[PDB]
Design a protein around this ligand. Sequence first.
Ligand code: ATP
Ligand code: ATP
Ligand code: CFF
Ligand code: CA
Ligand code: ZN
Ligand code: ZN
Lengths: 96, 422, 48, 107
Amino acid sequence: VVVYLYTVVAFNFFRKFYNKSEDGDTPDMKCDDMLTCYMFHMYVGVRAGGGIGDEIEDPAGDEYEIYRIIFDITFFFFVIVILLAIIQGLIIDAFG
Amino acid sequence: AYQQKLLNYFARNFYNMRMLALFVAFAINFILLFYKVSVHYVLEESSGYMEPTLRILAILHTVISFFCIIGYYCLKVPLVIFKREKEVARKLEFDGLYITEQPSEDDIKGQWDRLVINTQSFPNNYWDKFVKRKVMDKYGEFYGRDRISELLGSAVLNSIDVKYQMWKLGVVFTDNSFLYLAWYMTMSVLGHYNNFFFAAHLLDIAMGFKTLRTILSSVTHNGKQLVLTVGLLAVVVYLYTVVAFNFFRKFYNKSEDGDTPDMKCDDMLTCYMFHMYVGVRAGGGIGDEIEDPAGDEYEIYRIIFDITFFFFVIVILLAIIQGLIIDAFGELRDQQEQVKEDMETKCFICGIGNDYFDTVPHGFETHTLQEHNLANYLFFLMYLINKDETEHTGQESYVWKMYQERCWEFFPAGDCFRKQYE
Amino acid sequence: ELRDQQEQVKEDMETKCFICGIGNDYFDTVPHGFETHTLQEHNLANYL
Amino acid sequence: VLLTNLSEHMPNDTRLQTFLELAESVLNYFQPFLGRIEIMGSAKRIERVYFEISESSRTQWEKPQVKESKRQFIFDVVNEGGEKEKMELFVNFCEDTIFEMQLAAQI
Ligand SMILES: Nc1ncnc2c1ncn2[C@@H]1O[C@H](COP(=O)(O)OP(=O)(O)OP(=O)(O)O)[C@@H](O)[C@H]1O
Ligand SMILES: Nc1ncnc2c1ncn2[C@@H]1O[C@H](COP(=O)(O)OP(=O)(O)OP(=O)(O)O)[C@@H](O)[C@H]1O
Ligand SMILES: Cn1c(=O)c2c(ncn2C)n(C)c1=O
Ligand SMILES: [Ca+2]
Ligand SMILES: [Zn+2]
Ligand SMILES: [Zn+2]
């Protein structure tokens, strides 16, 4: 539910910061498809480890830079640290 | 009278359209992700009722939301308005705050309750009307004149309840739960106006499966070391930015190889947002997004700098942030455990439990089934209220008088009848 | 360890006083019992 | 009520016992109805009190809207509660549970 809420927000505002291609000279890939966006965020941002701030456009020189930094930093360390750590904690406490 | 029938239907049926509203919002946001970009539009995959049933279910959601809050208006609102009247009256009698206290600038709740004494119908539920005249004539002699004053004072124009109803709205609007469901209604309305943020109604999983008091559970165990600890992490990174800015004014390159118009970290402000956004969200540490130290006379300093400082930062600080958050869950589960276990071994009323009570087979089971059972006190109070005040027995009237006196030692503390025998 | 010592200062101080050193077990049966102990009886400044 | 009071305030009989088990489907019909409690009736000894449980209240208290409030109250008591307020808050719970029992009964 948290990742789906995120996909709602990022899809409904950040309709340019996704590039699966390289540098845009190749026929660039924004992931507008909501369905794909969600599987993207699971498959990539959860299996990232470093967070979704890696597979992303760099925020240099844009008037959404502050919002996207606050967005990324707070939201996804709040996601991966807390949620994945307590999933791990439940599974290990089962063994306990 | 159809409105009477209707509101009694909604109050009898209240705890099912919560589940229905959660199911409806869940099924709508099952669909809402089917979008694309042309300006936003929905595709058509299998069955061509996507747009009209989205329209229908948004209508139905908003109706069930308003439906539900009116059902909640007819329900628990009398219970909480009852509890507030009872607290106000039983602090006028045994304390008399509007005689003596005139309370302090904190606890503004009673200060709002000040606006209700000069109504027409003050204790209008309270199982009662009487205690107003009792208090204001028991104290109205050597604080006489003002209390004797403030005791007495279709075609309907101004003959309804005015100040009590305003006070009632004031107490209703300070609720947790009512204000929560009113915000839920307004989000239904604005999501009906714009179906993008209609998905905020998956936040009602906060009253999810067998976790009905999760709002109180999350409000309670907020450690607030964590705010001070995030402050500590910010201070350590700010100290770092001071040091790196004041010495290492060349080892930052956001560009590639310098043939591009290179980007050297200089702006203090940015240097700080850079270190948060990058070095904290690194994982590998700030030793990655950096110049390599090959061939420089600050190589030793920068290696010691990076290694010691940022494993000292990320390992220790981020691990103990994680530890605080997980230990919050640990406290949740421990209190949810030692409610149940020590309730199921040692009851309220005895308060000793199955140790010398233990030897009877099905012992504590028989205790809570027959002996006290905690509703027989409640049904006992039904019985001991609903009879007349001449037909009590001896023990019966005795318990009535001790209840009216507020003594509270007729509950058997430390011993019960089975233990009394010997 | 920090949090454990900060915890079992407060709890065993608030159940069993200095001077008695037995606390609310056979002292328990009085309502507001240990409260009355530390308020009236010893109070640790009345020694001072 | 009377036969229960005989058998309980005087157990360990030989005299009553044959009569006690003799023809009692009344006891089967009236152990949803008798409520027994325990108090101290100023003689400093525990004295059990037998009374009536209204038939319009077992349904009224075993249904939801009130069974909901029960667990919430048990949680707020056993979670945090001083050794003296226990019962005062308990009777406050009793009184507004009567109030809710009333206004749920009118439904
Ligand atoms: N003095 C007491 N007053 C009330 N309940 C007690 C007391 N002592 C023990 N109990 C326990 O309360 C439990 C009530 O049983 P149970 O919880 O299954 O039914 P319930 O209370 O209706 O369910 P729920 O708690 O889900 O509403 C019993 O297991 C009993 O052990
Ligand atoms: N023998 C004792 N001597 C001193 N204090 C005791 C003793 N036994 C118990 N206490 C506890 O000391 C506590 C003092 O109360 P409290 O800590 O609220 O005031 P304080 O000591 O002035 O506050 P602070 O500790 O913040 O200065 C009481 O709760 C009491 O239970
Ligand atoms: C009518 N009535 C009373 O008269 C009453 C009471 N509690 C105490 N009294 C005195 N309750 C709950 C009640 O309903
Ligand atoms: Ca009489
Ligand atoms: Zn008991
Ligand atoms: Zn002492």
